[PDB]
Amino acid sequence: AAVERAKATAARNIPAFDDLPVPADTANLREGADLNNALLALLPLVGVWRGEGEGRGPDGDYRFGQQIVVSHDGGDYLNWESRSWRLTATGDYQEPGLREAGFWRFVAIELLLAHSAGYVELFYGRPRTQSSWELVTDALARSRSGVLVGGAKRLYGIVEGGDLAYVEERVDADGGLVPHLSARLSRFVG
Amino acid sequence: AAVERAKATAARNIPAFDDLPVPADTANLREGADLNNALLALLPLVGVWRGEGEGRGPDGDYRFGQQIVVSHDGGDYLNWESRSWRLTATGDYQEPGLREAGFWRFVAIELLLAHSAGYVELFYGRPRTQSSWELVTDALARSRSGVLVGGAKRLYGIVEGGDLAYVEERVDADGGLVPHLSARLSRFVG
């Protein structure tokens, strides 16, 4: 079953224009531009990931679904996009959730993000193993209508079976990092 | 000829996954989720734009090609991606150029960006007409390996024939805004 799943995802790639003079974005390291040497520590992230997660809100815990797309065009960065959506307690689609887009660079890890909710964020961090990474917020800036937020720590890692798991903690008013989000996503592409 | 071009681009949309519970990203206001009412001032931007531009560098002026993708998923923001590439003086593909990704919001205009070169940027501004917009940098933050840059002013507008044109100025050391980039892009989608 595990060998077949890998075969299925290895045959896929993201939808992309094939008609530009620059390389098409690829989320499958079997296709497209060579991965830049700077990025080898991040190699397991490349792909499309889909699954569900759990968050801690004002009204208790809640469920969400999510897709993360991690691609590259042969440059010294990874393209990153995450889209989430709220699920009811019973697992039904409720409404759209948060979206973010940006880039990973490795040169120490940097994650540069814009958020649809109306702020930008810079994360800095380090690999913990060949397939796990830790990042912490170093800068935040919002637009006038943007949400008010605090710094975070994100821990990402490939877990047994190949899924991408993560935990995001946020700083509380009292300065302590507390649980905020967690998710485990199955590979869909790559 | 102009009616036929509009017909050609109106029949197209961006490559996108069609299998998620959230709406597929659309760069064609004839297809997909309703455009959020907050975004009507920005409506002419939605689409895929392709063309060439000119920049001012250390060694004189240079040419580049560019694609900008402006889409939405029914939320109160536009998705934005720009990819550029250097051209030789004679118009030949030279090497990849800069990439940025983020979101426009309208609620005053906000443009929130991550840049592949290693920084995040917040722009704030205002519509000048139904089809032109002005934005100025309010925040910049870089990663350790990121490029050193200064604030900019961007002016975007739809010009006669329907092309998207823009000018980007940067602040010089002496505090003056000077020409930096300009481009005129034809609609490819929408």
Swiss-Prot record, chains A, B:
Gene Ontology terms: cellular component: plasma membrane
One Pfam short name: THAP4_heme-bd
Q: Which residues does the record give as heme b binding sites?
A: K153, H180
Keyword set for this entry? Acetylation, Heme, Iron, Isomerase, Metal-binding
What does this protein need as cofactor? heme b
Q: In which pathway does it act?
A: Nitrogen metabolism
* Catalytic function, reaction form: peroxynitrite = nitrate
Gene Ontology terms, MF aspect: heme binding; metal ion binding; peroxynitrite isomerase activity
Q: Where is this motif: GXWXGXG?
A: 47-53
Q: Which domain of life is it from?
A: Bacteria
User: What class does this enzyme belong to in the EC scheme?
Assistant: isomerase
Miscellaneous section: Was identified as a high-confidence drug target.
User: PANTHER family annotated for this entry?
Assistant: PEROXYNITRITE ISOMERASE THAP4, THAP4 PROTEIN
**Biological function:** Heme-binding protein able to scavenge peroxynitrite and to protect free L-tyrosine against peroxynitrite-mediated nitration, by acting as a peroxynitrite isomerase that converts peroxynitrite to nitrate. Therefore, this protein likely plays a role in peroxynitrite sensing and in the detoxification of reactive nitrogen and oxygen species (RNS and ROS, respectively). Is able to bind nitric oxide (NO) in vitro, but may act as a sensor of peroxynitrite levels in vivo.
- Tell me the protein family, please: Belongs to the nitrobindin family.
What's the protein here called?
Peroxynitrite isomerase 2
Q: Which organism is it from?
A: Mycobacterium tuberculosis (strain ATCC 25618 / H37Rv)
The root-end lineage is:
Bacteria, Bacillati, Actinomycetota, Actinomycetes, Mycobacteriales
